[PDB]
Amino acid sequence: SGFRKMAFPSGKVEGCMVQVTCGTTTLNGLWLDDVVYCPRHVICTSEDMLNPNYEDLLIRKSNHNFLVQAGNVQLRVIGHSMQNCVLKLKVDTANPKTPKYKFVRIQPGQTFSVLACYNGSPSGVYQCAMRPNFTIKGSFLNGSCGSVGFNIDYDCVSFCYMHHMELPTGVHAGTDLEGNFYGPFVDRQTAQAAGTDTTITVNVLAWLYAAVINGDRWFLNRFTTTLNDFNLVAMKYNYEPLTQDHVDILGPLSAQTGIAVLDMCASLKELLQNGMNGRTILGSALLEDEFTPFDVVRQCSG
Amino acid sequence: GFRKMAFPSGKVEGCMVQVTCGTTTLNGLWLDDVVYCPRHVICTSEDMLNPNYEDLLIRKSNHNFLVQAGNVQLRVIGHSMQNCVLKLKVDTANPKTPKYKFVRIQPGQTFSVLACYNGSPSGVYQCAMRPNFTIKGSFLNGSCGSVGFNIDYDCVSFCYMHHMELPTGVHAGTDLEGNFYGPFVDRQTAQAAGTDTTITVNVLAWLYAAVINGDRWFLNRFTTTLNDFNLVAMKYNYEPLTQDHVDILGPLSAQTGIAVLDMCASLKELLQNGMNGRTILGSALLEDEFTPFDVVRQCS
Ligand SMILES: *[C@@H](O)[C@H](C[C@@H]1CCNC1=O)NC(=O)[C@H](CC(C)C)NC(=O)OCC(C)(C)Sc1cccc(Cl)c1
Numbered sequence: 001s002g003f004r005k006m007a008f009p010s011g012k013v014e015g016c017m018v019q020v021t022c023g024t025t026t027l028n029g030l031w032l033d034d035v036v037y038c039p040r041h042v043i044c045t046s047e048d049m050l051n052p053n054y055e056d057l058l059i060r061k062s063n064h065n066f067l068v069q070a071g072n073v074q075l076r077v078i079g080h081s082m083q084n085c086v087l088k089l090k091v092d093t094a095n096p097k098t099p100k101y102k103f104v105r106i107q108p109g110q111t112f113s114v115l116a117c118y119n120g121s122p123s124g125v126y127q128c129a130m131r132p133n134f135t136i137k138g139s140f141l142n143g144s145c146g147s148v149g150f151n152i153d154y155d156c157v158s159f160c161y162m163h164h165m166e167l168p169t170g171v172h173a174g175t176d177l178e179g180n181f182y183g184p185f186v187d188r189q190t191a192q193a194a195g196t197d198t199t200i201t202v203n204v205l206a207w208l209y210a211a212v213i214n215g216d217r218w219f220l221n222r223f224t225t226t227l228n229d230f231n232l233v234a235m236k237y238n239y240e241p242l243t244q245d246h247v248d249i250l251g252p253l254s255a256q257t258g259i260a261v262l263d264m265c266a267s268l269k270e271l272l273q274n275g276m277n278g279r280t281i282l283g284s285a286l287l288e289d290e291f292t293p294f295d296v297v298r299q300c301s302g
Numbered sequence: 303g304f305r306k307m308a309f310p311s312g313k314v315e316g317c318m319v320q321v322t323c324g325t326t327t328l329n330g331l332w333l334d335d336v337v338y339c340p341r342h343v344i345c346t347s348e349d350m351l352n353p354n355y356e357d358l359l360i361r362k363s364n365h366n367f368l369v370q371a372g373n374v375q376l377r378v379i380g381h382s383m384q385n386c387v388l389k390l391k392v393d394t395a396n397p398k399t400p401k402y403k404f405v406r407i408q409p410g411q412t413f414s415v416l417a418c419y420n421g422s423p424s425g426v427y428q429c430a431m432r433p434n435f436t437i438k439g440s441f442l443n444g445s446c447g448s449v450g451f452n453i454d455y456d457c458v459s460f461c462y463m464h465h466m467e468l469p470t471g472v473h474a475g476t477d478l479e480g481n482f483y484g485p486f487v488d489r490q491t492a493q494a495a496g497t498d499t500t501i502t503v504n505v506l507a508w509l510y511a512a513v514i515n516g517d518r519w520f521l522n523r524f525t526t527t528l529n530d531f532n533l534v535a536m537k538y539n540y541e542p543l544t545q546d547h548v549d550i551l552g553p554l555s556a557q558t559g560i561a562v563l564d565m566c567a568s569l570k571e572l573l574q575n576g577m578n579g580r581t582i583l584g585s586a587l588l589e590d591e592f593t594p595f596d597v598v599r600q601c602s
Pocket residue numbers: 027041049140141142143144145146163164165166167168169170172186187188189190191192193
């Protein structure tokens with residue numbers, strides 16, 4: 001309670017969604033300036049999906065085999081190339097709705113909004129976290145590939161995710177906008193599985209900071225720890241080790257509360273070793289790990 | 303395979319503007335040549351405790367209202383009040399005005415909120431109208447005039463405009479006719495809501511969602527009558543389940559092959575026993591802000 005998963009407003013991304021069709025296979029693409037980005041498996045027949053030779057499938061393709069549409073309006077394709085697992089289709093029209101944007105590759109633990117799309121039309125938007133096993137717990141059906149995940153910083157859309165697949169456990173995997181998968185997955189219809197997931201320590205710490213900011217601070221103790229000692233203990237509880245970047249992005253919440261990051265780690269260490277003893281934090285007996293330090297700032301101070 | 307999903311907010315973002323009167327700034331909704339916003343923008347500090355709004359509005363001029371759409375000021379050429387909403391007529395029509403209507407939602411229904419500050423969209427999330435006519439939102443200073451909405455076909459149904467926070471941290475507001483949901487009043491006083499209840503038909507929709515996604519540890523072989531379930535529900539401050547609700551659940555029942563009253567039997571067992579360590583769709587608590595329509599749209 002107090003916090004909810006808040007997505008970024010989706011309008012700037014909605015203005016960039018199109019559909020891309022090869023034969024009868026339609027998925028979503030992202031139209032920025034005069035380039036459309038989409039998953040390369042749009043060019044696959046199901047026979048060639050068991051294990052595709054993408055370079056060879058693409059040699060047989062011409063610009064005029066790709067049907068790109070913004071709604072019902074066709075955008076003529078004038079060039080094509082493959083970059084890793086994404087297709088780049090040059091089109092003859094620069095998207096007038098192109099926002100200021102960048103392509104970023106996010107780290108596990110970071111959150112982003114997903115604009116779920118089908119045949120080029122948005123259905124919904126929600127907030128996802130990249131798990132340490134490089135999956136997301138999304139909500140995706142057939143025809144959703146090419147949907148993108150993004151953050152907005154002032155004027156600028158940072159695109160971080162394009163959707164490609166669903167795994168047996170029901171979680172989802174995909175690439176950055178340079179076509180590089182997050183995690184060890186491949187865009188082939190061969191059996192693959194997500195590694196064992198772990199808890200996102202940096203986000204749990206952000207949540208404890210958030211609890212302190214709201215006056216819920218019984219779990220603070222008078223001790224500290226080294227980063228190494230904490231990481232070795234955390235791993236025993238299936239918690240991710242902290243990086244230096246994690247310590248850095250906790251900086252603003254550390255300053256707001258006056259609680260050093262390593263002192264908060266010592267408090268978390270005691271919670272892990274001793275449990276809640278029947279208590280709650282921000283209403284919950286469970287520790288939340290899908291709010292980043294930035295998400296906390298957004299909702300408390302923003 | 304299940305998330306709290308909001309409608310895409312682009313059609314509403316194209317309507318948000320900033321409205322300023324004196325030292326007060328909040329958001330307005332610009333449709334055609336009219337901007338809608340909470341009337342308490344005209345309020346001063348020395349009047350917020352018992353504001354005679356009709357009296358305060360007659361003392362204002364069109365030029366006291368600064369409306370800005372981005373870096374562009376819109377000229378106000380007229381103004382009226384409809385209940386707790388101020389209507390500012392401006393000289394230019396919003397070309398981004400979508401197909402739309404104003405609706406009043408019922409408790410238990412859900413909608414998306416576009417939280418805005420200074421006329422700029424900041425975040426989007428899904429909310430439910432609580433049975434006590436509050437909403438559990440995330441709203442800060444300056445968020446007033448933010449709107450809640452649903453989308454059907456290409457039509458945006460506006461149902462909520464944000465006015466206030468209660469001491470318990472929940473929120474209250476009006477429909478776009480300016481009528482509050484609940485017994486709340488747009489004066490600067492601490493106000494409390496009636497006792498809340500849990501939206502039972504929605505908890506059931508969410509249990510069906512957890513089945514669809516393979517969670518079924520909570521199912522059982524028992525069955526219950528509708529009335530006997532409702533007796534237990536009311537004891538735990540759950541809303542009673544109507545036969546219209548049973549019908550509304552049919553698709554989810556058919557899709558899973560679990561009779562509605564069988565799912566009621568599972569919910570009764572959870573209410574009486576608890577979850578006992580276990581979680582459903584990741585939660586330790588029963589979720590009641592997904593409607594049947596919500597769950598279906600997302601599992602279809
Ligand atoms: C978009 O094309 C689509 C999106 C999924 C369809 C249903 N929900 C989705 O998120 N993507 C695909 O269908 C994938 C296309 C391939 C990767 C080129 N196919 C896919 O997701 O298959 C999953 C694997 C890789 C075969 S692992 C697996 C094995 C057995 C059972 C399951 Cl559920 C997954």
